[model samples]
Target: RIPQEKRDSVVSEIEQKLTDRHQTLADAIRERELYFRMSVVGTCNLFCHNEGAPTSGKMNAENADRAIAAAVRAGFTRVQLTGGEPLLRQDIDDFVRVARRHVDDVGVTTNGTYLPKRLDALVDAGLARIHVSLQTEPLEEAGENGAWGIPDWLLPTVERARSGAFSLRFNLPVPADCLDRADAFLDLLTFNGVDVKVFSVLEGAYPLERLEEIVEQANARAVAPAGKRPGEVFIRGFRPPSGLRCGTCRDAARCMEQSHSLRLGADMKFRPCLATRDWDSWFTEEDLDATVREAALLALDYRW
Candidate 1:
């Protein structure tokens, strides 16, 4: 935990930086989208990344609070915390508390191991959404052994959150092998009264045709016929826009320019998006406002 005196000092500095950009930042904020996702920590308890690309440690709570404040000022209505595993951090509640002051909705993406223990504190700290990644084979097995491959305690925790004010969802990363298992996964989540979102693998190209087929099948199973309880499923991918005229293309560029989303590393370096390893600069005390403004302007002009 950060000492109160030090925490207040850091927050004051951030507030002053924000004050300098108050008017211009407010103008930019009005043009932003509704959702922003931020990765607050740099450690995970999963095999989602290569061993050579592992992340260690987490961002200090002070810097995280500053980033969340900046994001809220930039006009993001919703904020989602993601990382190697956000739940691994002991200061998650502090981060969530700061985020709640600025954004209407605060959410987190986790591996689900620590969720059962931290769910109450997270929700109490104003987290309205929870996205759990169930990406392994053993995690998807259904039955009494693990409650549809989930840890025995996780289901009950999820059930409590569902019964309360939180919105719960499962994120399934669909590699080639996982595609066939997608239907069963959706079935299990539906039975538990939860929503599932499927994402295509970020590192490789997936057959769009196959992806669409999977989405269609999942949605077919998700939707109820009549009075039956309805199930929800969402499919997300990194595919670019299909049809575009030169003029329309320019409009798309303008939209990107006005985009409200940002990805800040635990090290304080700014990334344009989650998939990119490119770093703009470390956000420091000197020229903090200038760096942020420049990046915001550059983001408007660059295409993802």
Candidate 2:
């Protein structure tokens, strides 16, 4: 929540706060170490965690374009477009088109409701992937014996979306208690030949050793078998950022591969880390690149 006009002072303070690690982080960002998560649409009907972000107002394709350009200039090679539902916007295809031109990779994080309708246009715009915030009800409803399964209503959309060149991934944030369900969910998706990204919040329910073993089993399952199930499963993280003890985490190295990035909020602010509310402002258009550099500096302290 920085004042828009005081951009220069912020830049000065960020420069003043530099340390050896900060400089290293800054250089890392310039070497394309940054992964830009851009939230184009602000609001959503699902009322997920994104509802709390300050949208300020509706974001147009132009605003997204400018942000993408600035991030590219700052040396981010990858971009992820997100929202309560990025597909809520009518011009999301435009956003994808603009983003595809800048980043080496461009993806969308959506609820998957509107994806079927927009899939063709987005693919035409060179969308590299679609990471859907998968609804947990499907997993919740499944039985232990694999009798109950993914809803019939979802198959058409899932199949249709996967038919394209763009990768399709089901992204799920699994709570500690939901490990069993998460496991089942992965099995179901893998059976259907769909890739998945699981954010398993261990929450001390499972020891680091246990989680590592689980992931090892999953890693094997992900690649096991005939052409029946070809999709890979990636268990990205083992704990919440707020509770992370990186030095002791067995999966910390692998976790960093998924979370080491900056999130460009719908308000045009940069969140170096999602656990922290401290967002680096992108308010001053003239200072856009400077703001991105400052965000990299902020990541030195904020990120895992």
Candidate 3:
């Protein structure tokens, strides 16, 4: 395990890198259209209960607004609000309103716990896309550690999403134990007219003994069949700068460029790499606008 102090230091660096990348990307978009996606906001209602995440304790209207505003100023065409549960904020509508005014796409990542209850409200609030979280179908197992354990009320919410109330997608951690169920889950979504996004687990907490087996299974699952390109339902990408996670991906370039990615903290900092946890090295609020500017220039100058 990384020492606490060392980890903190690294996180600080990552923060700086994040700011640089966001600003850089923002600038690139101004001179010419760039297909860019930014996760400017991070925090969620389910944050505290997330097995591997630390509680942001900053999920609220203010943070949401700041994120949207920053993304706009940075020239992001796509902006997503992710959190402890973005819907938990009483004024989530306010952020949505601001994002819509500036961006082509506005979306949120939620746990679906409160989705059904607020479906119409979210639509009225101008949510363009919704990504709901899921790991497995076993309600008992999911609930054991996850917040609300895939609430019984949420299943119907999934159904509602399938009905076209909103553009809906599912995000799941691909564990080997759940390998057999991945395709089945996709079938469930397709049957209901919903899209499923399968992602590999990121948190180091996953049992190491099963890691290789799970990855191999997921990779095989990700392979496109002969004469057919892989569809979005079967493959998804994750962000952040973790070499351990993505260094070996054969399709890393495609995934990184296409994924809706961001690096952000509750304190109003964004990062470019998930593995680089330090906020200082990447970017932070102190000089965010300038940071974005420099980063944007660098990104444009970069070969990739």
Candidate 4:
């Protein structure tokens, strides 16, 4: 998340370089029309939270394709597919391809374990970005069955992503007292040119302060030879955030970005903000084309 003052003052320089779509998206976030996360499958290797989602959470390939089309028709400028683990579906590449057909920036969020088998097909299908969730500090002991465990092969995947065919980011989430793991993992991944994004764990220690501590050392540490790939860091926020505009929160630009875009669950519900499901819409084809999209614009601006 961008600090509000920094987001307002310094970001204009970044926007100046945006090639227009960047500027367009910044406006979209501030306006709250369309950023989307489409969950294709709700089942994961671990059933914990996924079990809490809709029982009919996995989408058939036909529904996946229709969902993407319907969302794009609703003004979604970028379409992303996420999951309990999206790679569980065999047709993930097909999902990526259809999203690409609608928008140039199509993304996927994965558990990293599936990257080896699905990476090639996903890239081949024109996936624009891939975000792999890796938590050095997992909620479960030693991390679950190579899923959140973050395998050694991920280093090579980071290396492969340098080819520039698509942008790849690593997501680190912890449920913390996690300063050590964040420091160590960022130390490993940052110099490798990976863009690492951090997310907050529910009822857990916030990692941003620990992140600031690590970066205090990091900003100066890179040296020669490989010539400093020095990855980028994106954050969801520093604290537990609120819903929509009440959640829009004057100071929470970084986490607020999520509200700028909506997440469509595997059950076909639309989330105006992920923190609260109260505003969610169970949409129809017509709903996606206009009604819910308009509703979200209004919903995000109203305070709870």
Candidate 5:
């Protein structure tokens, strides 16, 4: 970890560079026919309450329908079920049924603790892909517990996914200290024929002193990184993020950015992205379709 004294300056410099490059990156995605993986459901089973995450208790059936309608109307061909833990809701199959009607591809991102038990159910529900969260080899320090118990279930679950029952991918959280372990995890997954995606941890206003460490590790291992700002790390299959930054990325120009996948406010207002929500400014109150349109327009506005 970088010393606390130097972190502030580093964060400021990085954020400024990112803000300056945001629009250039956004433009690239706008010009492509990239798939939009919009979140149609909330109510996750795990409650990490990480940096910008809303708590679990906030997701309910009423909001689930509203969120789904918004995604479908947004013209998203791909839909992903996400939450503090999406399977926490008993009617998860019902939600999948709704998604299948509107979207071509459907998937779910889960913590994996409960996944082993729910695998058959999820596959039966028409899940095209399953993204299991593997934050760290050791789960305790990774802040995943209960249903997120690591090491024991992650690999086994991947094996099950490789059984041809469904498409499977492993999502590793780029933790500060455990960045070094990313490679072994990737190797393990790839050997099992399971795809891999590395999710960068967004520190918001604070600096995760280990950012460079994580980037370096990702570069060395060739693990594709995803987030609002992917920095200098380049991997063969890296996908660009759908943040304010668009055209500036030197690699793939148009990326299927998932940063706008799900948005939850502190007050229970569910939208697709934070900027589209009525945070400090409330425009003419509108429906979910209007909100998605505004988000799409925002993406176009930021694109170069």
Candidate 6:
């Protein structure tokens, strides 16, 4: 269904555009507000493969240490550890300690299953924030006898986090089938003083208009009288490009330029964004600066 020649041509064109934006790219790299997201582990406990994540391999602590050093040298102010499941890594606390030494803010995104067990070590190691991904499907109908569903231990873990040092937020995807449950989920989160980050389902998973409406409702709940902490709900917009097999965010480039955030994949490659596969390797410390520059260029050149 696709021609290799056309794909090659487009790649070449993107490369040229990156070259053209050389100085802008360099400036973007030097921007002080830039933050780094490093995937310290691989192998998720969830259906991550369904979201187009790589199926295998994990980053070791040695590599993670080197990557954090490089990111710090490049002026990254914040670093967020992500993964197939970052908690799966044995030396995650060590990695968090290393990151905390270099950056002011250290955060992790997780499925929340292991947070109850690992939260103390991570917080002691200077973890400043956390993003917990929650699945909204009814617990009764969840597959694997709800083994892969929301863990029962999450509520206690979250309550503990409320009194702990680090800030906590919950990420939820709004699918058409889950719309009916969105309100209940929001109520639960806001009542507990937890902020919610909402994302729209892509690949025809749900209608965009409906997703927007759900976000509006969720935002309204954040301001309701019963909403204790006045938490915010962020709604992310999905815009797949036309005539290209690859997907990209419409406002990602602008956001990256403004926020100066970089994402390091589990494979030790720097990605422009989660939506695009284009990446540059950053394995060795010898080429760290050049790798950051290249990554910045690639990020700036992302198609709208």
Candidate 1 segments whose C-alpha is farther than 4 A from its true place: 1-34, 44-58, 140-148, 201-211, 223-231, 241-260, 275-279, 286-290, 300-304
TM-score ranking of the models: 2, 6, 4, 1, 3, 5
User: Candidate 5 — worst ten consecutive residues by lDDT sum?
Assistant: 276-285
lDDT winner, 3 or 4:
4
lDDT of each: 0.60, 0.64, 0.52, 0.62, 0.50, 0.64
| Residue runs of model 3 more than 4 Å from their true location after superposition | 1-67, 137-151, 201-232, 237-260, 278-288, 295-303
lDDT of 4 by residue, 108-133 (tens): 88877777788889889998888887
| lDDT of each residue in 28-82, candidate 5, tens digit only | 3334333344333443233223344443343444555565566556545566777
Model 2: how far is 230 from its true place, Å? 2.3
Could you estimate the TM-score for every candidate?
Answer: 0.69, 0.72, 0.58, 0.70, 0.56, 0.71
Q: Model 5: how far is 270 from its true place, Å?
A: 4.4
**Per-residue lDDT for 247 in model 5?**
37
User: Which model scores highest in TM-score?
Assistant: 2
lDDT of 1: 0.60
For residues 4-109, could you state the per-residue lDDT of candidate 2 as single tens digits? 4554564455455445335544466654456788888776343334436435563667777777787777667788888677888787888888888887599888
Candidate with more favorable, higher lDDT: 1 or 3: 1
| Clash number for candidate 4 | 4
Predicted candidate 1 versus true structure: per-residue lDDT over 1-304, tens digit per residue = 3355643454354345546656344454454443555677775333544532233344666666666666555544677888778887787887789788877688888888897778778978988888888756546454444333555657865676556567888876776655666656667666555777766664566665786776677677764433444447767544342211112333343232223356666556765433333324456656545555444432332321
